Amino acid sequence: GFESPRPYKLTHQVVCINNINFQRKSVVGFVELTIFPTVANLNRIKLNSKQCRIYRVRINDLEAAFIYNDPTLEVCHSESKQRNLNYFSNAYAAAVSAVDPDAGNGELCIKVPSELWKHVDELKVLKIHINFSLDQPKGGLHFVVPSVEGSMAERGAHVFSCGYQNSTRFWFPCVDSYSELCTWKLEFTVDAAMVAVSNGDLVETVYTHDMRKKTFHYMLTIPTAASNISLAIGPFEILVDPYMHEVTHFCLPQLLPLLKHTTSYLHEVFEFYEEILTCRYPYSCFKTVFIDEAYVEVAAYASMSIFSTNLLHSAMIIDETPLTRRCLAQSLAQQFFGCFISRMSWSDEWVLKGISGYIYGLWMKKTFGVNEYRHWIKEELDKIVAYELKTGGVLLHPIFNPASHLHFSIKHPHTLSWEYYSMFQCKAHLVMRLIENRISMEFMLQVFNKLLSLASTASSQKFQSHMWSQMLVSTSGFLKSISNVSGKDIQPLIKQWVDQSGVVKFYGSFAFNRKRNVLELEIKQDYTSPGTQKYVGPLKVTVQELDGSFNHTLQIEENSLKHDIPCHSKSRRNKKKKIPLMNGEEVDMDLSAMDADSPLLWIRIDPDMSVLRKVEFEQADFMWQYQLRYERDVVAQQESILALEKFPTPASRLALTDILEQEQCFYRVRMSACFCLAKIANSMVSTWTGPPAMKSLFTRMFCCKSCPNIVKTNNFMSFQSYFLQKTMPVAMALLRDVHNLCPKEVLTFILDLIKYNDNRKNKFSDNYYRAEMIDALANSVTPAVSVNNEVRTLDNLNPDVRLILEEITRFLNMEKLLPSYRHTITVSCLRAIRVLQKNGHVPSDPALFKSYAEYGHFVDIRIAALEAVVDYTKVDRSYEELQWLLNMIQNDPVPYVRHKILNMLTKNPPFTKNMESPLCNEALVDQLWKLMNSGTSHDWRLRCGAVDLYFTLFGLSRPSCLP
């Protein structure tokens, strides 16, 4: 039941771009649109064009006058001096509504000829031909040209689509709406050596008569949204997957070995998606493109994908292979559902995004184990609860903007902040997991299969928005499909979390009555905060008992503040016996610390996390230690580790040490136990007569028994040793003293580990571990206190700091002689240099970071250097450094880097709105307002970063310091 918002329906669109010039960075092309009027007197036709100039527009080969106005280019009038962000946001929302593809109004309007009115009333095929030339298109695509002068194919210059969501309109005029569905025919005249990459399979290739160029014709069988379509032109090497003939791999020249390792696990991800969903992959062929300076590290398109060159990794390289593997899986999941099924309306994105995230999560659970998936879900839950407390609430399915607490409007994805948009997608994936907890997974997979089946039938037909309506999915349709499959609607769950836009925080205090042998639980909710919401739903609590593990569910009714559950017999304490754990295996547990009066070993609230929740339950120290030692659930172990953070008992420190010593324990839980051990040691300083915490552990596992200083050669074959090895000296540096200074002996031990570090035994790379060692050296250094404001000098430089400075200086020089694969050592050296400059040992230099931030240096080096400049500008309150960051955003070759600078500036503002700093000049406020008004519109993500920076600096209310 879908009716097109546009009166015209686009049956098919032809995309042709010819004679693209890398030197001029100019794209010239002619596009033909085939539309069928669904109403008489269609008259004026509106299409979405941004920064597009047409030589002429012909409808049915008849010239038609066209008028183009772009509100987004000038959201705020030059005469208007309003400096309140709320006024700018309201104007931006109105401008976005005018350019919205879903909205009937369009930025470009074409007046149908007087003689074409007679043809427009009868419903007949209508063809529009537009020829367009863009001298420098902004946000349509990104052109990368190397400094060396050579043939563009020979020098490896590459072109790829850039921007997010509806960025398709900038490169070529089109109906950029998810609701609109049409078959796609793509023809591109590119160089012979270069291979064009386009959505859909390539039907045919014809050589040009000159033969220095050729013509790549692309046809997509499945109708898709305009946003999905993308074009990349480069001399990409062509690789065909051995496992699957359809899958094709494209990489920059000489990066083929990295590409082979990156796409080695791609077939396994495809098999997992095929196993979970009966329907086979819809697209005839799948193409992967890896390009330098990518706008997004992971991008999803219909039958096509875009990834950063940084993702490509060699077999020896480690710690980047999982990140590349997960990025491929999430993009493939989006291709399976989000690309295959277009959104019926704007308010519908969450369901498609959530399904893609949920299926990717199922793949992660099988590939990395259930424990990794549970830890990942806990991380997702933590991000949402913190973000809602920080600002407003994460509202999905925006039915209007409704939730006004967020300054950005929810009307458009471009209006929404990039961080908020990511949080909204994460919440949708967690909501799908909540449905999986409520209803069996097999039923959930069956509902997904039905949606895929509707899309397949739409693809088979050409029914204009009739069978194509079936492909488009709605939230109502999703609820109905779940209700049919299980007999239970998910609408109450959707109303409780998605509609409310609230998070739940529970504080628990437990009182035990020995005479009645029952446990009484008191739950109080901080729903007073606007982001937080009241929960009347039941909460499941698991209480461990001597008899065994038992699950109790008590509804959190407002009327009843106390919930009472019976306690099992304590006979197991009286006579020693095995105690069954939640997992099938059971182990004997010491009961001396546990009180004789209370049988329960420990209490866990919502360990399953069936419903999203935040838990703040008070429990005795010894019970937390018992929970960490015997817990079979990683999330419960993580909460116990954080509860021991607020418990400086030597038995709590012992529990963390026992977990590290224990084999068959999650490596991430052990890494958290390492950090917590350091924190506890720093709280009970002067109560420890033993050797520094974790120094003995490092000697026991990573060092020879005969010699403590000597370190056994690193071996990364296990893949858990590297994580455990890297976290130990970091937490040893965090371990301080009674004077809160990292011990010289600990620093000397870390220096010895670097000196004896070997590389002729590790079959994998040690550069990732060596970067961690540089970070540990920076953490160990403690700032000197200047006397009479003494200037930092080489003579006054601390000798212990000088050894750290010597190591980082040698590492940076070695990095210049031999570069790291991701320049991890250089990024660590820049972070260490910033710490030394911030400390009273080395005078701070802004220029050293600024030179690293330049385009010529590697992108990873640039982002780290820019972050150091952002820290410097905040610390010194330097107006010129802030202006330099703003200037770089105004003129940055890579769009991704410019957005990152704005995001980092928001993360570390030079001045908060409440504070009154010398950087309160009206001209600075005007410059930020001008940046939001123009020069950020094309990216569609730059404006979101600028708006969030304006908020942290001044806010909704007009700047307190506005002359």
């Binding site: 990066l255 330049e854 240096h857």
Partner: peptide, 25 residues
């Protein structure tokens, strides 16, 4: 210049090729 000299960072005409390729292979 004598103490703690850092080799000057140099712009790369083709940064991805040099950084991605392993120094030893």
């Amino acid at each position: 210049v004598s103490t703690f000299p850092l080799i000057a960072a140099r712009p790369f005409t083709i940064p991805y090729l040099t950084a991605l390729l392993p120094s030893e292979l």
